[PDB]
């Protein structure tokens, strides 16, 4: 019961999803203590941003459970609300191969 | 019965050795549809060219390690290019790579 990026626009609520992590923004420590991280991830179907409480790094492949979407006005964003549960299921990275130098 | 890149003479036969792909370049194509790949290979005794048959481009890589058997030589366009014999072969038997992983930025 998964879904895709550009399909989803503000509203929309319950949403399970796998994706890769492109970029990661700038921290804000709410005075009450929590890590609210906003971040840049997507599937191949375009792009989107997300907000995280007290946890990810680019290059990661994330499974999202029971997350939901609505907009912080600058384009809709994704939450982890009902309980929410983001899991990592694999990696991805850029790789460079060359023949050693000789002799 | 093996011989080094260094101890190689044009007009030689029974060519059984092992070497590694240094660079691939010079793609030239027949109108059978096939293509012949000019590669630079070597051993610890020196470097040398080769003209290879393979209709698929991107699969012959720097790092590849191949076992030449009963192949042969003749100069081509002034440069010495190596060929396989009509009863020997070429097997890829391993690899050797400067590998390097990361995640980019945007």
Curated annotation (Swiss-Prot), chain A:
GO terms for molecular function: DNA binding; DNA polymerase binding; G-rich strand telomeric DNA binding; single-stranded DNA binding. Residues 20-86 bind DNA. It is found in: Nucleus. Phosphorylated by ATM in response to DNA damage. Phosphorylation prevents degradation by the proteasome, hence stabilization of the protein and accumulation within cells. Ubiquitinated in a FBXL5-dependent manner, leading to proteasomal degradation. GO terms for cellular component: chromosome, telomeric region; cytosol; nucleoplasm; nucleus; site of double-strand break; SOSS complex. It comes from the Eukaryota. Its main location: nucleus. GO terms for biological process: DNA damage response; DNA repair; double-strand break repair via homologous recombination; establishment of protein localization to telomere; mitotic G2/M transition checkpoint; positive regulation of telomere capping; response to ionizing radiation. Keywords: DNA damage, DNA repair, DNA-binding, Nucleus, Phosphoprotein, Ubl conjugation. Component of the SOSS complex, a multiprotein complex that functions downstream of the MRN complex to promote DNA repair and G2/M checkpoint. In the SOSS complex, acts as a sensor of single-stranded DNA that binds to single-stranded DNA, in particular to polypyrimidines. The SOSS complex associates with DNA lesions and influences diverse endpoints in the cellular DNA damage response including cell-cycle checkpoint activation, recombinational repair and maintenance of genomic stability. Belongs to the SOSS-B family. SOSS-B1 subfamily. Component of the SOSS complex, composed of SOSS-B (SOSS-B1/NABP2 or SOSS-B2/NABP1), SOSS-A/INTS3 and SOSS-C/INIP. SOSS complexes containing SOSS-B1/NABP2 are more abundant than complexes containing SOSS-B2/NABP1. Directly interacts with ATM, SOSS-A/INTS3 and RAD51. Interacts with INTS7. This is SOSS complex subunit B1. It comes from Homo sapiens. The chain holds residues 3 to 109 of 211 of the full protein.
